[PDB]
Design a binder for this molecule. Structure first.
Ligand code: A1ILU
Length: 144
């Protein structure tokens, strides 16, 4: 359901922004894995990320749509690709915090909405068939 995925996307942005939320076991596991992916993307794509300014929520939405088109270009879905969506929204929110021309403290609420909309509509059916978040994602990524 949308509400569950919106809460995961909002919880991850609050984790990256260092603001209080507590989160479910699914959200706790996702925060750990997505942050590890995010730090690896930030190191490997440093020069690339520094060349593009994200000064509005509309710019962030357009960049997000272009990134998703390339991430899923071959029509394949897997859990690693889904974790990368959350790592990506963490990078977008860090750029918007620094660069948003009209700062708005509620912007993270709009980014997590369009991330939840993408996940539900484009990957939701695959997620349910693969166990959902509690029997699919958590089972694969929770500590050994
Ligand atoms: C230099 C590229 C560019 O100009 N981008 C851009 C920035 C980031 C970006 O990140 C995606 C998400 C992480 C990485 N994908 C993967 O690691 N995928 C794995 C997962 C399993 N299969 C492979 C790439 C892509 C492109 C622009 C559009 C951009 C700049 C700055 C910001 Cl804040 C956003 C976008």
């Amino acid at each position: 359901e949308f509400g569950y995925i919106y809460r995961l996307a909002q919880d991850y942005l609050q984790c990256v922004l260092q603001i209080p939320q507590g989160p479910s076991k699914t959200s706790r596991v996702l925060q750990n894995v997505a942050f590890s992916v995010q730090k690896e993307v930030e190191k490997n794509l440093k020069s690339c990320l520094d060349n593009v300014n994200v000064v509005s929520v509309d710019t962030a939405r357009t960049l997000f749509n272009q990134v998703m088109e390339k991430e899923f270009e071959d029509g394949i879905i897997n859990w690693g690709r889904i974790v990368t969506i959350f790592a990506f929204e963490g990078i977008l929110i860090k750029k918007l915090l620094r660069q948003q021309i009209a700062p708005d403290v509620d912007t993270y609420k709009e980014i997590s909405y369009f991330v939840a909309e993408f996940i539900m509509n484009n990957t939701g059916e695959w997620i349910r068939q693969n166990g959902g978040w509690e029997n699919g994602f958590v089972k694969k990524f929770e500590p050994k």
